[PDB]
Design a protein around this ligand. Structure first.
Ligand SMILES: [Mg+2]
Ligand SMILES: [Mg+2]
Ligand SMILES: [Mg+2]
Ligand SMILES: [Mg+2]
Ligand SMILES: [Mg+2]
Ligand SMILES: [Zn+2]
Ligand SMILES: [Zn+2]
Lengths: 135, 77, 97, 112, 16, 29, 91
RNA sequence: UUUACUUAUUCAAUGAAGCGGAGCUGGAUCCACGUUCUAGCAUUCAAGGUCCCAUUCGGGGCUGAUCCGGGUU
RNA sequence: GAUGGGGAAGCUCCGUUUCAAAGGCCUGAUUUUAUGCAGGCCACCAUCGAAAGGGAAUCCGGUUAAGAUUCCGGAACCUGG
């Protein structure tokens, strides 16, 4: 049936974040007054962490594991859905319709998303999500 | 040559370190093809570019002339 | 035949024609079968197959190009992909096609 | 009725010796040498002109900022939006197909 | 602080 | 170590770039 | 309103070169200036760029082919023979 | 006389890169089961595995990537 | 049209990247043998040949007996640091 649910991982195909992997936080099938089309509120990774080896020290690993996130409202036609899933319970509250309207609650939302993504990547979950797409 | 429209920017340009000379030029023009009026152009000579500020108000132009810095070398007319 | 089943769907069922409407039906889950023409580019076909895998939708590969698919669906223009939204009068869904 | 002359010593109508007639503040007509017009940069995949990129002679690109020579997207500049989108789609789909084929080959080796 | 961060990461590895 | 992964390279024909090998037998002396 | 009874495209040559040669040229010129279906996008938009090179105005696909036609009979026979040999090798 | 050989001599190519032989190497005398829906991508002594160090930003060895040859093919 | 080479009794000839050891760069307290340079990386050929081909960037006004996009006045631009 419907696969564009919360927690679905997609690849952005248009815009500044083209080719980057996001996770859908809030779908909107019927649109709204702003963005009058089917769209989704997503959180993704702008700057992927670098690969680390056995020889890297603590400071180098800390530098190379940094993640810069972003939050975006994106049209459905500009998303390519995948078969992968990602838990969005940790930042479900901070990514909302009113987050984008107010400058700048986006900063707090991105801080929450950055902390969640970095903790999950350090835990070692969602290797495909945290791996950069090469094209 | 550049045209400036901000009065604070013009004052900063007059107080800039490399700026030494300015020129005040008076033109007699017509507003909306009506009565004659007086237009004043202040031209600050920078190192690279010449800055022009155009004022169509005689009283404001006189006030700006009074407010010009004293070390700046002003060439009238 | 498959052309007869398609004609029965056209005269009795619900359908949509074209890649964008087919993708919208697949995303909304309203699609039930997608017919893909033979001369459809492989990247387009792969994207349609991935969407059909996500939405659990059957795929049929029409033996013929977009001109033949347009003739089969009864139009005077080429169609690359056809999405069947509702086919109850026809037996196309319950058969092998 | 005022006739003009070349302002340089090349007397021939070559591609680098083109002129236009301009009236000066002195009230006279004079020739003015025109540089060859610039060509828009092209996409590396389809060959179409790149949207949002300034059109300059190749030496002049060293004098402008990075905003005039790029767009804010991956492959911004060298490739266009549609080609970038197509290669993103191709990369994702082919990687998924590679995973599928590896799993299928492992299952076939196990069953064989 | 580093030890506490390592403990938190290991707990997240267990519970995630 | 959850941060490290095994990514073997395919050095077969039509695959990743060949690694450096001792070509002393093929040296043009 | 047909303007010429038989010369057709070879009316640009006037009374020169001989009638049989003009007919021979007419056949191949009609072939080389005809419009052909694209095997990829399904549209009748393929025209000759240069001899042996056939480009589709839509979809920008370029195919090698014959000097004055897209596909020659010898090329079609070669294609069928190669298909039969490949099927025999696989089977 | 017939039949062989290579080392003189002759011809050609290359980035003198994978030649010849053997694997208590594996699968079935033959093969690398490392590459064939797609106008993507493939580069920083290679990641990983295993022995050390004196742990500290990391550094070494074997392997990954079988061995041997007195012939660049 | 030299060099590396190869012809020619020889003045000289062929050839233009070959048939050559044809040259640059990175790291280092190299487990120290005590004042001797070790570990690596990338590779192809001189030079001449266009005042109409390619090419960084300047205009206006004035000035002489004869100079002028070059001088003078004003206003710009390029390149390198
Ligand atoms: Mg010579
Ligand atoms: Mg020269
Ligand atoms: Mg010239
Ligand atoms: Mg003169
Ligand atoms: Mg001067
Ligand atoms: Zn393009
Ligand atoms: Zn076509």
């Amino acid at each position: 049936a419907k696969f564009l649910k919360a927690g679905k991982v997609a690849v952005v195909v248009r815009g500044r974040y083209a080719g980057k992997k996001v996770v859908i936080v809030k779908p909107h099938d019927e649109g709204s007054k702003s963005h009058p089309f089917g769209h989704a509120l997503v959180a993704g990774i702008e700057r992927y962490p670098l690969k680390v080896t056995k020889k890297h020290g603590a400071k180098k690993v800390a530098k190379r594991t940094k993640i810069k996130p972003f939050i975006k409202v994106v049209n459905y036609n500009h998303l390519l859905p995948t078969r992968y899933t990602l838990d969005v319970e940790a930042f479900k509250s901070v990514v909302s319709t009113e987050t984008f309207e107010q400058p700048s609650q986006r900063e707090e939302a991105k801080k929450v998303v950055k902390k969640a993504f970095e903790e999950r990547h350090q835990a070692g979950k969602n290797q495909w999500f945290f791996s950069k797409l090469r094209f | 040559a550049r045209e400036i429209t901000d009065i604070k920017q013009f004052l900063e340009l007059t107080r800039r370190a490399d700026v030494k000379t300015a020129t005040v030029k008076i033109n007699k023009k017509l507003n909306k093809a009506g009565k004659p009026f007086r237009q004043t152009k202040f031209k600050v000579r920078g190192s690279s570019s010449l800055y022009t500020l155009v004022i169509n108000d005689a009283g404001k132009a006189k006030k700006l002339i009074q407010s010009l810095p004293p070390t700046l070398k002003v060439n009238r007319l | 035949s498959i052309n007869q089943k398609l004609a029965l769907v056209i005269k009795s069922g619900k359908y949509t024609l074209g890649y964008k409407s087919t993708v919208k039906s697949l995303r909304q889950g309203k699609s039930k079968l997608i017919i893909i023409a033979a001369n459809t580019p492989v990247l387009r076909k792969s994207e349609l197959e991935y969407y059909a895998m996500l939405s659990k939708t059957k795929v049929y590969y029409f033996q013929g190009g977009n001109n033949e698919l347009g003739t089969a669906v009864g139009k005077l223009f080429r169609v690359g992909v056809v999405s069947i939204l509702e086919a109850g009068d026809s037996d196309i869904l319950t058969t092998l096609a | 009725a005022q006739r003009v002359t070349f302002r340089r010593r090349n007397p021939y109508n070559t591609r680098s010796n083109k002129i236009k007639v301009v009236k000066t503040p002195g009230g006279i007509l004079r020739a003015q040498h025109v540089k060859k017009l610039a060509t828009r940069p092209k996409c590396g995949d389809c060959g179409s002109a790149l949207q949002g990129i300034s059109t300059l002679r190749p030496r002049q690109y060293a004098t402008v900022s990075k905003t005039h020579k790029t767009v804010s997207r991956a492959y911004g500049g060298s490739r266009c939006a549609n080609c970038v989108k197509e290669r993103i789609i191709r990369a994702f789909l082919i990687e998924e197909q590679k995973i599928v084929k590896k799993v299928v080959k492992e299952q076939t080796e196990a069953a064989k | 602080a580093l030890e506490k961060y390592k403990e938190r990461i290991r707990h997240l590895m267990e519970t995630l | 170590n959850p941060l490290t992964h095994s990514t073997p390279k395919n050095f077969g024909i039509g695959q990743a770039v060949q690694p450096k090998r001792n070509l002393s037998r093929y040296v043009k002396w | 309103a047909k303007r010429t009874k038989k010369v057709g495209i070879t009316g640009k040559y006037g009374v020169r070169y001989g009638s049989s040669l003009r007919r021979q040229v007419k056949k191949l010129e009609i072939q080389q200036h005809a419009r052909y279906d694209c095997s990829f996008c399904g549209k009748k938009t393929v025209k000759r760029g240069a001899a042996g090179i056939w480009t589709c105005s839509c979809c920008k696909k370029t195919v090698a082919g014959g000097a004055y036609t897209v596909s020659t009979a010898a090329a079609a026979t070669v294609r069928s023979t190669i298909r039969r040999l490949r099927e025999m090798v696989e089977a």
